[PDB]
Ligand binder design. Structure first.
Ligand SMILES: C[C@@H]1O[C@@H]1P(=O)(O)O
Ligand SMILES: C[C@@H]1O[C@@H]1P(=O)(O)O
Ligand SMILES: [K+]
Ligand SMILES: [K+]
Ligand SMILES: [Mn+2]
Ligand SMILES: [Mn+2]
Lengths: 138, 137
């Protein structure tokens, strides 16, 4: 039986710039670093950066919708997003679904998101306004 | 400040086979499905499948090391991995780091992992034998 996400590993092209992004701009806790990677945490999330020569800096129009969303409070959301924009962090999508979201890119083009709201909130909102063809399971 | 992972979203090329993979082979809870996606949960993890025409079925030698690992108990690991093998789910590497891991591919080539062990456990093991050039904070 699976009990949750154990860790998220991101391939990065340059270790020090990527560590600075996740530690300083996103406020994650840096636990350890070595010449091929780094270990960070964000609440319960175990984040791994892996230095990978196969990684290319990918513009958002050349990658699919796969993306990673981090939780933030309603009160912190707007100034956090504004600080990222002032830091030159690129936006890859305008928010369109329920709950505050800021869609931004990491230094290698990994697609990230800040989101306010849980799965329960999304399901309740979708029951009120169902997506095309949407069905629910008890 | 950020408080954790809110959700993981995977682009998929065929919605029904991917739902069957995550719901039936991995045992995740299917909450909702629509013409272009699905919502599942795995413990506290909110997983979204997004039907994407752009999604390529990507061989593991043409993608980088980005991958997603799910937690499983030590008692459950061996038989869960064996069921994936019997279902023909591909393995993309052998375990070379501390703590039981099974490295497998989803139908579109997303790199997945079953793993027993926490961050605290990995940090404990690294303090006994650090990786190359390792610095501790
Ligand atoms: C919540 C799932 O990722 C989708 P959204 O970000 O389009 O809402
Ligand atoms: C835990 C970080 O992904 C690396 P590993 O799976 O190679 O140990
Ligand atoms: K949203
Ligand atoms: K391992
Ligand atoms: Mn999202
Ligand atoms: Mn891993």
């Amino acid at each position: 039986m699976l009990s949750g996400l154990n860790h998220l590993t991101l391939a990065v092209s340059q270790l020090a710039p990527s560590v600075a992004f996740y530690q300083q701009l996103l406020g994650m806790t840096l636990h350890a670093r070595w010449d091929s990677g780094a270990y960070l945490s964000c609440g319960d999330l175990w984040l791994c950066l892996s230095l990978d020569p196969q990684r290319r800096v990918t513009p958002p129009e050349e990658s699919d919708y796969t993306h990673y969303a981090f939780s933030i409070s309603e009160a912190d959301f707007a100034s956090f997003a504004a600080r990222l924009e002032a830091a030159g962090v690129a936006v890859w999508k305008l928010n369109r679904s329920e709950g505050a979201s800021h869609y931004f890119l990491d230094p290698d083009g990994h697609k990230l998101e800040l989101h306010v709201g849980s799965l329960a909130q999304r399901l309740a909102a979708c029951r009120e306004q169902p997506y095309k063809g949407m069905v629910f399971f008890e």
